[PDB]
Ligand binder design. Structure first.
Ligand SMILES: O=c1ccc2ncc(=O)n3c2n1CC3CN1CCC(NCc2cc3c(cn2)OCCC3)CC1
Ligand SMILES: [Mg+2]
Ligand SMILES: [Mg+2]
Lengths: 487, 175, 487, 192
DNA sequence: ACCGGAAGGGGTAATACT
DNA sequence: AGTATTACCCCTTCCGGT
């Protein structure tokens, strides 16, 4: 019974929905490269106990855990995201190890939640490394029951390595996958040259990074589009498949297709070519067949009847039947909660800063824990110095409280330490343990100094980041799947 | 002259409101998700969806030129939606469908919006909880839509839900 | 290739399928009164922690746990059973507390599963009471990972207090719900008269239990169908609704239907009445409407124009529109893996035997635990007798093994006793703990004596069962919703 | 032709093979690991209609039955011609649980009621999958399906043979007929 | 022709951009 | 017309007994 307007209600509702979709539904994050659904699924799979060192678990359990505790949305979208993260032909570096029928590059759909099973991958466990050491912030969920992270540590640059793609209200995002081994060099250059300007950093990074490396091999023609995309943030890259010419015993020529560009359907290609063959298109084709066996890969056979010696038919296929396509790269990402268009150096610097912050936080947490343990152990050894008197006072006590009070007033020891004093086990009274206490204290008081020295010098942090990233790259590396040629 | 119409989404919330309503002066109509954007699609395309036809049949009045307010079946059309972000989108789509087709039905005061208490929607509330909060005529609180400027409302509708994308993006960024 | 023939394959396949359906798909167990799906759902919800003390949890989590761990079937047949076990109009005593839209007696589907929450009820807790004390056998699941129970303890007679209904290959079962107090009286009589023969026990349990008590209130006419069902196992029970005659200010007479028989659809009733009125041949009826509000209950209004004095219209409604219906009671259960039809005395004696076996096994487990616990306390007091020498021996040692050998040689103790001495904390060395150990040893010895005495005489187990059942009945119990009238 | 059929490449009926498999996930998994030259997959849906109980006019309108009849190519009842057969090997491949064993018996009773000469000539085969390395055919991938079941060099198939016609005629009516008392007595007698 | 455990599967919309 | 996260929903069969 209140006279509200229609313009105000319309504007408020539409603005709220648009901001929600833009910030928390579709656009990726510069620091981590994961949408909220992907991050929630990964965290739910990590915390529930699904790890590469354990056997496969049903995807239904992980989907239900994500739907209940963290993600308050439908099940179909969550399962679709989980299936997509485990597809080698869609992700350059998969983040989910799946067992079952997870789909096909053509029109075949994946099986239901009841059949397929899924766990994490060894490369995905590097994204969640040291997440319990207060490396990242935590926030309560929608109902305020449990806590979920705001961003994964992301020890490797997932955003560029796997790419991104999304549609928002008034915006869109498309980022092509890259090669980890060549991104490592760019990150090392950024780490070693922290006092570099924008132009020099951009030039060096573009020199170190050649271009995109799509998971489906293919081919890239030209070099102007990649330069335009890296210099500004919006450019077209021309992708092309491979065609091989072969003959038979009778001398009939043939065309063999074994690779297709990124995000190009297999059944749609064959259907479009067949229909355009039935109609008056191309120049000459006898018949088309598909022989893409499971153990062979992809093999599409096209028969040219008598002429053209497989020279102009290839050009016609390139310019007519989606054998050559375009990728409209447009790098859009969310920084500190706001969308922005960024170049390559911007992403590299943001990732480096995130890694440095994670390292600093982990070092601080470890230092605090080691300091508290050292305090407890020092109190314990001070108690051990007077074992006969301690045991005599403990034995001649009416209850625990008076014993604790006498321990406090005798050894000049405060609380917490006295509780561990009274928590001795007799098994730890032999001389071996009485010397093990000394050894442990000696180790810990040096570990504290080492951690303080690490915290005191940024060069140590940069070296730690470089060493860890180098080890990660050395363990998990790949070649250039996509070959880049000239015009 | 006394009946009321409650438009909801889904058969879950539809049944929950149906089993906890006053059957004398309350009718409930469930939908099947988001509405087709009338402003974008052609008139032929929108006039074919099985849900828009249901809405026009339920209301009973005409559309566009052949609109007669004397054939109205319910004198109170209340748009019920969930409290999440989706509930703020579907409703607005409806707020276009009533504005584009049944334009002289809004400024007379026959359209209202309900306010559920703050659950993730009406599908979680049972029959009893839907009475003393949103459906009891002595406890419920609604909002009545009014029209003051016609050109401003039309231009806002076209800017927000038209076919131009750059203008919508600029408006969203600015405000 | 193999000539597998046609007759052998047909017989093998159909016999296997029919036997599986008969045994583990439809027919319920006599001892527990639950189908495998219900038992698996209850066990999964109990193990996952969804208890009445804790808040409601999403039903998706319970369904996923049940499907992934125990039940290797679809999610529809699991959620349907889960939502059916929490419907007051279907179960006399619900076993699940559900929050959300769980359905309606009409044609409204039960919500979706992402909107509804579910947890256990106090009755299900009594059903799952003392299940971890080796009371029932456990078997591995389909994949062999974990263990699941083969029968729930069933501290109260669920089979007769909730009824059953199922269709199998070659047979079907139908059992009506009863009242808890009347079953308790019969069980008490059976417990106190264990030496009675079949005829006397059957007569006593037929005297104590009057007849079925459906959750939808209603009515029942005659007393021969229930007698036939209880004496032979098959019978027909006639149920009838509740109609009242009222008059308005003008003088028109109206029939108000306020109760309907068991398992009768509310909307189909009105639809059938309207169609039969339209087709005629029923009676002089003005109109039929449903005024059943949420806060009013079932209320169907039928208007008769001027005649029949609202007397023959009632008879026509009885005879033509399902206001008076029949129930084909046929008690079929599974005993030791075999389907049989049983009378009331059999269904009482089997439950009594199950309760006695459960009590015996629980008492044996408790006695074994107490006997194994007393050893550690005996070793502890033996060490406390020579505490100073024990401490001196422990201090003058180089390794824990030397201390163990010295303690074994000195105190004449087992390895377990020496280990318990070694992991004794210092806080338990005060005088208060020294006396507490003595008190605990004395109490443990007294408890061992009591547990042995319980097993010594069988006449105490019956008393224990009677006490527990009396407490359970006094806690939860309703009255006769369905009243019995004459012909 | 049925819209769910995945026809092979060879046009010679003497070398082609048709696989009848329940569901769609199993069919999709088998389509990737099959030899496209001599193997066609026909994915059914749910449980088959009981031809022995329903009337002729009702079983002639079922989508699955019509799809099977169209895919096989031959006629039904007295209009059956063996010369129009397209696949010389119809292989039933179902799951290893009781539900698969029931779908298999429904399909076998359909083929016996409508296309008896196919069973007479031994054109029908049964395929058994490995037990454990598996509660369903949808949990397997293309490589494992090919390595054990669909590989012509390493596989085991069962051939259904019909020696006596009267015994089969009476047994099918006893097991899958309208009567219940005879079926219950048969089940009870054969249980032990 | 329902009552209850089981098998299986498709189709309408928003929102951008090439 | 297709990419990818979002909203929502129905329709065949088996197996008895009245
Ligand atoms: O309403 C309809 C109308 C047509 C239709 N056609 C094919 C089809 O598959 N479906 C059609 N529908 C609906 C529906 C499938 N429906 C929704 C998804 C659900 N997923 C199975 C599942 C879900 C969950 C599980 C396990 N399995 O555990 C955790 C919680 C969620 C299965 C039933
Ligand atoms: Mg919602
Ligand atoms: Mg199965």
């Amino acid at each position: 019974i209140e006279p509200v307007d229609i313009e105000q209600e319309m504007q408020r509702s539409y603005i709220d929905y648009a901001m929600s979709v833009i910030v928390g539904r579709a656009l990726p994050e510069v620091r981590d490269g994961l949408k909220p659904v992907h991050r929630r699924v990964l965290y739910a799979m990590f915390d529930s106990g699904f790890r590469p060192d354990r056997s496969h678990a049903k995807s239904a359990r992980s989907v239900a855990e994500t739907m209940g505790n963290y993600h308050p949305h439908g099940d179909a979208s969550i399962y679709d995201s989980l299936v997509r993260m485990a597809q080698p032909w869609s992700l350059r570096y998969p983040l989910v190890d799946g067992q079952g029928n997870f789909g096909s590059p053509g029109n075949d759909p994946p099986a239901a939640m009841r059949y397929t099973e899924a766990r994490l991958t060894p490369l995905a466990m590097e994204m969640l490394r040291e997440i319990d050491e207060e490396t990242v912030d935590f926030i309560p969920n929608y109902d305020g029951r449990v806590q979920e992270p705001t961003v994964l540590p992301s020890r490797f640059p997932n955003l560029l390595a796997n790419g991104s793609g999304g549609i928002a209200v008034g915006m869109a995002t498309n980022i092509p996958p890259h090669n980890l081994r060549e991104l490592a060099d760019a990150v090392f250059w950024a780490l070693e040259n922290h006092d570099a300007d924008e132009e020099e950093t951009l030039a060096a990074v573009m020199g170190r990074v050649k271009g995109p490396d799509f998971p489906t091999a293919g081919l890239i023609v030209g070099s102007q589009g990649t330069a335009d995309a890296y210099k500004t943030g919006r450019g077209s890259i021309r992708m092309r498949g491979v065609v091989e010419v072969e003959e038979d015993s009778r001398g009939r020529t043939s065309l063999v297709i074994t690779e297709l560009p990124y995000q190009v359907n297999h059944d749609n290609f064959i259907t479009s070519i067949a229909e355009q063959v039935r109609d008056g298109k191309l120049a000459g084709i006898s018949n088309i067949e598909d022989q893409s066996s499971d153990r062979v890969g992809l093999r599409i056979v096209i028969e040219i009847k008598r002429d053209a010696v497989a020279k102009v038919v290839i050009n016609n296929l390139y310019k007519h039947t989606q054998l050559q396509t375009s990728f409209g790269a447009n790098m859009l990402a969310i920084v500190d909660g706001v969308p922005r268009t960024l170049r390559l150096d911007q992403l590299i610097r943001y990732y480096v800063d995130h890694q440095l912050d994670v390292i600093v936080r982990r070092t601080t947490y470890r230092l605090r824990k080691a300091n508290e343990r050292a305090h407890i152990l020092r109190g314990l050894v001070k108690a051990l110095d007077a074992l006969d008197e301690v045991i005599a006072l403990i034995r001649a006590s009416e209850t625990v409280d008076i014993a604790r009070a006498g321990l406090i007033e005798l050894l000049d020891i405060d609380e917490i330490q006295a509780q561990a004093i009274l928590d001795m086990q007799l098994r730890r009274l032999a001389a071996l343990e009485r010397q093990r206490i000394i050894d442990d204290l000696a180790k810990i008081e040096a570990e504290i100094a080492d951690l303080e020295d690490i915290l005191a010098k940024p060069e140590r942090q940069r070296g730690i980041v470089r060493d860890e990233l180098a080890e990660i790259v050395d363990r998990h590396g790949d070649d250039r799947r996509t070959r880049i040629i000239a015009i | 002259r006394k009946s009321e119409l409650y438009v909801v989404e889904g058969d879950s919330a539809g049944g929950s409101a149906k089993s906890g309503r006053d059957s004398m002066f309350q009718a409930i109509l469930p939908l099947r998700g988001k509405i087709i954007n009338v402003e974008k699609a052609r008139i032929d395309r929108v006039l074919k969806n099985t849900e828009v036809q249901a809405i026009i049949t339920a209301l009973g009045t005409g559309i566009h030129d052949e609109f007669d307010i004397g054939k109205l079946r319910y004198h109170k059309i209340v748009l019920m939606a969930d409290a999440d972000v989706d509930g703020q989108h579907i409703s607005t789509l409806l707020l276009t469908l009533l504005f584009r087709f049944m334009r002289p039905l809004i400024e007379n005061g026959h359209v209202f919006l309900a306010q559920p208490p703050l659950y993730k929607g009406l599908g979680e509330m049972d029959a009893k909880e839907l009475w003393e909060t949103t459906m009891d005529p002595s406890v419920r609180v609604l909002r009545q839509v009014t029209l003051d400027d016609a050109a401003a409302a039309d231009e806002l509708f076209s800017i927000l839900m038209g076919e131009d994308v750059d203008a919508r993006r600029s408006f969203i960024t600015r405000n």
